Design a protein around this ligand. Structure first.
Ligand SMILES: [Cl-]
Ligand SMILES: [Cl-]
Ligand SMILES: [Fe+3]
Ligand SMILES: [Fe+3]
Ligand SMILES: [Fe+3]
Ligand SMILES: [Fe+3]
Ligand SMILES: [Fe+3]
Lengths: 173, 171, 171, 172
């Protein structure tokens, strides 16, 4: 037992390690999407910047969980970061929709983590999750929904060939 | 009677209280419209900001009338602020047209208030209305007509029209 | 159902809409009090400013809840904003006591909202309430209690208490 | 007949001259009140400076009316400035009530002026009065009402602290 460990359940420690893996996977997914849009046959430079920014943000999320693990006296256990679902994301609107699904998945995992934390009467963990992750997920999900809605209304794939270009310039640029 | 009251008719006092309520109602309508555009399935950020700004401006018009009522020694009476007609404004052009309708309604109320003030030989009230409200209304109504016209000509409910208008006119 | 909605109970959506109406009501009450102290037969300018500031804060609270409603994927439904209980608030201490009662009623509404969010295992909502509302309410309630206590001790309805408190505390 | 005169009724010209005299009279009244509060047995410095400022503003209102008379082609006719109704203004509250009565009388004269201007179809004069005088009067009157209300609620002579505290904390 660590000299700092107090009121920290083995289940919470394990769940935190799982969340670390999931944030790493999300970073990887966003990296994949970013360089999809860097392809010369896709060439949407602001989509690529947007997703690269998201990837680095997810990496930070994971590092903050690793820090938390150590603060509470748990022990980090790392697993394979699995390859993203695909290498071709097929359009700006589809990439946005995939990111929305990903972030809702991460949110669900964090909500189950919070529920585990309350069931184990770990207020520090409940507040850590509320303070640093829950509103971030809500804000991210809302932003992705707004982006999907706009691409949809614009006719993005294919209805209007200007849609992805204009959205890249005026929303993501 | 108030120690400040001079040449201020009870009909004018009553009309000023009605106008106060109308300005507060306009503020409420604009707040409703603004957050309609903040929905994730509408997502037009500059429409939402535009209408929020108009909402705060309407609140300011109401408070200027409350100050005026007190300045002349009338007494403020507040009524319920009615909920707006819709919670769904359906489109950027529809909301712009509803705003134009609302602004012409407010203007007609202000013109009737000026006609009342004229009948009561209240030049201070006439000039209050002229100075602070009449050209404000004319400018608002011209701006809204301009907006409606551009959204019309752009083909707005072309799927790009609301997007582009939000970016380049309101943004 | 909204594309963004997740772990957001229908009951919580309805409670947030009721809270929006209550915050707007508080804004209306504070506006009414503020311009009570603006009339020439009351004439306490800093009481007026204080209550006007509170009115604008309450409007901000309402708008933040509408933003929240949209963020979570619910739909804003607006209703009449009821006229305040009085148009004449009769004294500075009485207005401060009415404001205390109002803030306590808002706080009780927020506490019931938090309990509902706890029952529905919505930790995002619980922290929204804890972050933006609960301690602001405790601070507002203590500040109002402070004001009431000083006005009570100064002998407020001594003819000087209201004037002195208006200058030396609310100035 | 002035080379600049246009749409300017003789009646309006006469009424402008009467207004000039009234504004100068108001200035004189305020001067009187100011130095009442400067005497050693009254000794309220901020009452004194408030009413002095009021006097100087009244003189400005008079001079602007003289400018208008000349702008429109009228001829200024000046008359005795009457001595004020009182040498002793009795108290801070009483002086503010007298100031309130004075401004309400000037306001009534201005409203009668605007009515005459309306009747003679003189929109330039109507707007001169609206722009420079009507809301000035409304604001002055509301201010004096506020002051009277506070003094009387403080138990001012119409508590021996009320005049002192009002002089320090409101007129300071
Ligand atoms: Cl002529
Ligand atoms: Cl003091
Ligand atoms: Fe994350
Ligand atoms: Fe918390
Ligand atoms: Fe308005
Ligand atoms: Fe509030
Ligand atoms: Fe004058």
């Amino acid at each position: 037992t660590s000299q700092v460990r107090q009121n920290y359940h083995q289940d919470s420690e394990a769940a935190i390690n799982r969340q670390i893996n999931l944030e790493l996977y999300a970073s990887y997914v966003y990296l994949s999407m970013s360089y999809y849009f860097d392809r010369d046959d896709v060439a949407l430079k602001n989509f690529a910047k947007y997703f690269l920014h998201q990837s680095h943000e997810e990496r930070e999320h994971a590092e903050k969980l690793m820090k938390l693990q150590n603060q509470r006296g748990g022990r980090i256990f790392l697993q394979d970061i699995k390859e993203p679902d695909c290498d071709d994301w097929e359009s700006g609107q589809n990439a946005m929709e995939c990111a929305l699904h990903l972030e809702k998945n991460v949110n669900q995992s964090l909500l189950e983590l919070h529920k585990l934390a309350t069931d184990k009467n770990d207020p520090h963990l409940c507040d850590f999750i509320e303070t640093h992750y829950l509103n971030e997920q809500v804000k991210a999900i809302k932003e992705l929904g707004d982006h999907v809605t706009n691409l949809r209304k614009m006719g993005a794939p294919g209805e209007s060939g200007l849609a992805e270009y204009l959205f890249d310039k005026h929303t993501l640029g």
